[PDB]
Amino acid sequence: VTSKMDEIQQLQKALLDYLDENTETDPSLVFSRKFYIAQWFRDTTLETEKKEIETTGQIMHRAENRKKFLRSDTVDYDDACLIVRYLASMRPFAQSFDIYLTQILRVLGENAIAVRTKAMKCLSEVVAVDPSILARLDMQRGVHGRLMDNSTSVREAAVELLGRFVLCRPQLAEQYYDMLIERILDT
DNA sequence: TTTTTTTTTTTTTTTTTTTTTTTTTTTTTTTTTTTTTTTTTTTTTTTTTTT
User: Fold this and answer.
1) How far apart are CA A156 and CA A141, in angstroms?
2) What whole-number distance in Å separates Cα of residue A111 and Cα of residue A123?
3) Contact yes or no for A161/A123 (Cβ under 8 A)
4) C1' (B36) to CA (A151) span, angstroms
5) Which nt has its C1' nearest the CA of A154?
6) Gap from A131 CA to B22 C1', Å
7) Could you tell me if A181 and A143 are in contact, meaning their C-beta atoms sit under 8 angstroms apart?
8) Which nucleotide, over all strands, has the C1' atom closest to the CA of A153?
9) Where are the HEAT repeats?
10) Mutual angle of helices A152-168 and A137-147, in 10-degree steps
11) Using CA atoms, how far apart are residues A177 and A173, in angstroms rounded to an integer?
C-alpha cells in the first residue's frame, strides 16, 4: 500500500550493467550477478512449460542469456531500485497476499482455542495496518461469527478488533456501533 | 560589582521488573458407593449342679 500508488530483456541488461559497475566498487557482487542470471534462466524455462512460437522465442532468449553471461551505461542507484522493484512485481510473489488471506479464514473454524485467539489478534493487527480491508464479505461474516463465538478469549479479541477499527477511521463508524454497543452484557 | 565557573536539586524519560487479571488446563482433596469385616449379641445345646 505504500509502494504501488522483449524490452524486459533490455531491463535485465541494464541491471547487469549496474551490478557490473558495483563489482568494481565492491566484491561479492559477482555472486549476485550469477544468482540473478540463474533465476532469469529458470523463470523463462518455467514459463515455457506453461508452443513452437514461444519455443523459438525462448531459444533466442536462452541463447542470449548464455552469450551475455559469457560477456562478463550511466545507469545509477535509484534507477536500479525502481527497475528491480518492477521486475519483482512481475514475479509470482507480489500477488500472493490475497491467497494468504484465504488460508487464514480456514483457521477460524478449528478445534483449539489458543490458535483461533492468536489468529484473530494477528488479523486485528493486519486490519489496523491497512484500514481499507473490511470490504470483502467473507471476512465480514468471519468477524460476525467470531463475535458470536462460544469462548470468552476470541470474544474479547474480536471486540478489540472492531473497536480499534472504529477508532481509526473516524466517520463511517455508525454502522458498527449498534452491533458494538449490544455486547456490553457478555458475562 | 560584575562576570565566569562549579554543584546541588528537581523533574522527565525510559526500561526493567513487578503486579494483576483472566482464562484455560490439570491434578487432588473431597465426597459417595459398595463391601465387608469385626465385634457384640443371641441361641441352643451341652454341661454342671441341685432336690
Assistant:
1) 17
2) 19
3) yes
4) 48
5) B23
6) 29
7) no
8) B23
9) 94-132
10) 130
11) 6
The Cα-based distances of A52 to A43, A48, A57 in angstroms read: 18, 10, 8
Strand B contact residues in chain A (59-118), C-beta within 7 Å: 113
C-alpha radius of gyration, chain A, whole number:
25
- In whole angstroms, B35 C1' to A9 CA is 92
The set of cell numbers assigned to A42 is: 529458470
Distance between CA atoms of residues A79 and A87, nearest Å: 12
- Experimental approach was cryo-EM
A28: DSSP letter? T
- Å resolution of this model? 5.3
The grid coordinates listed for A72 are 562478463
- For residues A119 and A108, the answer to whether their CB atoms sit within 8 Å is yes
Strand B, nucleotides < 7 Å from a protein CB: these are 22-25
Q: Which sign, positive or negative, has the C-alpha torsion A129, A119, A161, A171?
A: positive
Q: Is A25 exposed, middle or buried (0-12, 13-18, 19+ CB in 10 A)?
A: exposed
